mmCIF file of all heavy atoms in Angstrom:
data_model
loop_
_atom_site.group_PDB
_atom_site.id
_atom_site.type_symbol
_atom_site.label_atom_id
_atom_site.label_comp_id
_atom_site.label_asym_id
_atom_site.label_seq_id
_atom_site.Cartn_x
_atom_site.Cartn_y
_atom_site.Cartn_z
ATOM 1 N N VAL B 316 -11.737 50.767 -7.862
ATOM 2 C CA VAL B 316 -10.616 50.513 -8.761
ATOM 3 C C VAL B 316 -10.846 49.223 -9.552
ATOM 4 O O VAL B 316 -11.538 48.322 -9.080
ATOM 5 C CB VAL B 316 -9.289 50.416 -7.959
ATOM 6 C CG1 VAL B 316 -9.320 49.223 -7.012
ATOM 7 C CG2 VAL B 316 -8.077 50.343 -8.881
ATOM 8 N N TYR B 317 -10.275 49.147 -10.756
ATOM 9 C CA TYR B 317 -10.331 47.942 -11.590
ATOM 10 C C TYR B 317 -11.756 47.436 -11.804
ATOM 11 O O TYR B 317 -11.980 46.230 -11.906
ATOM 12 C CB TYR B 317 -9.489 46.822 -10.970
ATOM 13 C CG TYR B 317 -8.054 47.211 -10.691
ATOM 14 C CD1 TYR B 317 -7.435 46.879 -9.491
ATOM 15 C CD2 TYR B 317 -7.311 47.891 -11.645
ATOM 16 C CE1 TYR B 317 -6.117 47.231 -9.248
ATOM 17 C CE2 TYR B 317 -5.998 48.243 -11.412
ATOM 18 C CZ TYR B 317 -5.404 47.914 -10.212
ATOM 19 O OH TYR B 317 -4.096 48.262 -9.976
ATOM 20 N N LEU B 449 -1.744 41.584 -4.043
ATOM 21 C CA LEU B 449 -3.162 41.940 -4.047
ATOM 22 C C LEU B 449 -3.492 42.924 -5.157
ATOM 23 O O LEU B 449 -4.504 42.772 -5.842
ATOM 24 C CB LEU B 449 -3.597 42.495 -2.691
ATOM 25 C CG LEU B 449 -3.668 41.482 -1.551
ATOM 26 C CD1 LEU B 449 -4.096 42.157 -0.255
ATOM 27 C CD2 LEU B 449 -4.619 40.343 -1.913
ATOM 28 N N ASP B 450 -2.644 43.935 -5.330
ATOM 29 C CA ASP B 450 -2.851 44.911 -6.389
ATOM 30 C C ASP B 450 -2.814 44.209 -7.737
ATOM 31 O O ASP B 450 -3.571 44.555 -8.643
ATOM 32 C CB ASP B 450 -1.805 46.026 -6.340
ATOM 33 C CG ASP B 450 -2.076 47.120 -7.358
ATOM 34 O OD1 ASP B 450 -3.229 47.599 -7.430
ATOM 35 O OD2 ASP B 450 -1.139 47.502 -8.087
ATOM 36 N N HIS B 453 -6.090 41.901 -8.015
ATOM 37 C CA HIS B 453 -7.213 42.823 -8.183
ATOM 38 C C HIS B 453 -7.215 43.431 -9.581
ATOM 39 O O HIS B 453 -8.269 43.572 -10.198
ATOM 40 C CB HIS B 453 -7.186 43.933 -7.132
ATOM 41 C CG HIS B 453 -7.384 43.442 -5.731
ATOM 42 N ND1 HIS B 453 -7.222 44.252 -4.627
ATOM 43 C CD2 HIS B 453 -7.735 42.224 -5.257
ATOM 44 C CE1 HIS B 453 -7.460 43.552 -3.533
ATOM 45 N NE2 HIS B 453 -7.776 42.318 -3.887
ATOM 46 N N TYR B 516 -13.089 43.849 -4.290
ATOM 47 C CA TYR B 516 -11.695 43.653 -3.891
ATOM 48 C C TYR B 516 -11.430 44.174 -2.480
ATOM 49 O O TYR B 516 -10.530 43.685 -1.793
ATOM 50 C CB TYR B 516 -10.738 44.379 -4.847
ATOM 51 C CG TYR B 516 -11.009 44.214 -6.328
ATOM 52 C CD1 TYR B 516 -11.438 45.286 -7.098
ATOM 53 C CD2 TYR B 516 -10.779 43.000 -6.965
ATOM 54 C CE1 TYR B 516 -11.663 45.150 -8.459
ATOM 55 C CE2 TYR B 516 -11.003 42.850 -8.324
ATOM 56 C CZ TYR B 516 -11.445 43.931 -9.067
ATOM 57 O OH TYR B 516 -11.670 43.795 -10.419
ATOM 58 N N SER B 517 -12.210 45.167 -2.058
ATOM 59 C CA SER B 517 -12.010 45.813 -0.761
ATOM 60 C C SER B 517 -12.165 44.849 0.412
ATOM 61 O O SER B 517 -11.749 45.153 1.528
ATOM 62 C CB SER B 517 -12.958 47.005 -0.598
ATOM 63 O OG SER B 517 -14.301 46.624 -0.848
ATOM 64 N N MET B 520 -8.854 43.924 1.590
ATOM 65 C CA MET B 520 -8.186 44.997 2.311
ATOM 66 C C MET B 520 -8.575 45.012 3.785
ATOM 67 O O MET B 520 -7.765 45.388 4.630
ATOM 68 C CB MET B 520 -8.461 46.348 1.649
ATOM 69 C CG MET B 520 -7.991 46.408 0.209
ATOM 70 S SD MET B 520 -6.246 45.952 0.069
ATOM 71 C CE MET B 520 -5.466 47.292 0.964
ATOM 72 N N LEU B 618 -8.877 51.945 2.001
ATOM 73 C CA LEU B 618 -7.837 52.123 0.996
ATOM 74 C C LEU B 618 -7.849 50.947 0.027
ATOM 75 O O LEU B 618 -8.057 49.801 0.431
ATOM 76 C CB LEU B 618 -6.455 52.201 1.648
ATOM 77 C CG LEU B 618 -6.100 53.389 2.544
ATOM 78 C CD1 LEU B 618 -4.736 53.175 3.185
ATOM 79 C CD2 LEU B 618 -6.120 54.685 1.756
ATOM 80 N N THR B 619 -7.619 51.231 -1.250
ATOM 81 C CA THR B 619 -7.369 50.176 -2.216
ATOM 82 C C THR B 619 -5.931 49.713 -2.023
ATOM 83 O O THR B 619 -5.162 50.352 -1.304
ATOM 84 C CB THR B 619 -7.553 50.672 -3.659
ATOM 85 O OG1 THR B 619 -6.556 51.655 -3.962
ATOM 86 C CG2 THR B 619 -8.936 51.280 -3.839
ATOM 87 N N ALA B 620 -5.573 48.599 -2.653
ATOM 88 C CA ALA B 620 -4.213 48.073 -2.560
ATOM 89 C C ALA B 620 -3.193 49.111 -3.037
ATOM 90 O O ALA B 620 -2.140 49.298 -2.421
ATOM 91 C CB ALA B 620 -4.089 46.784 -3.354
ATOM 92 N N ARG B 621 -3.517 49.782 -4.138
ATOM 93 C CA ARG B 621 -2.623 50.774 -4.723
ATOM 94 C C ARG B 621 -2.485 52.011 -3.834
ATOM 95 O O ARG B 621 -1.385 52.531 -3.651
ATOM 96 C CB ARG B 621 -3.099 51.163 -6.126
ATOM 97 C CG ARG B 621 -2.252 52.224 -6.823
ATOM 98 C CD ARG B 621 -0.762 51.906 -6.796
ATOM 99 N NE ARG B 621 -0.457 50.562 -7.276
ATOM 100 C CZ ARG B 621 0.777 50.096 -7.433
ATOM 101 N NH1 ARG B 621 1.818 50.870 -7.154
ATOM 102 N NH2 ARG B 621 0.976 48.861 -7.874
HETATM 103 CL CL1 CL C 555 -7.382 47.040 -4.471
#
Side-chain angles (χ1 to χ4, degrees):
Chain B
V316 64
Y317 305 135
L449 289 179
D450 185 49
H453 295 171
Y516 314 112
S517 53
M520 301 306 295
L618 293 174
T619 66
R621 179 50 52 175

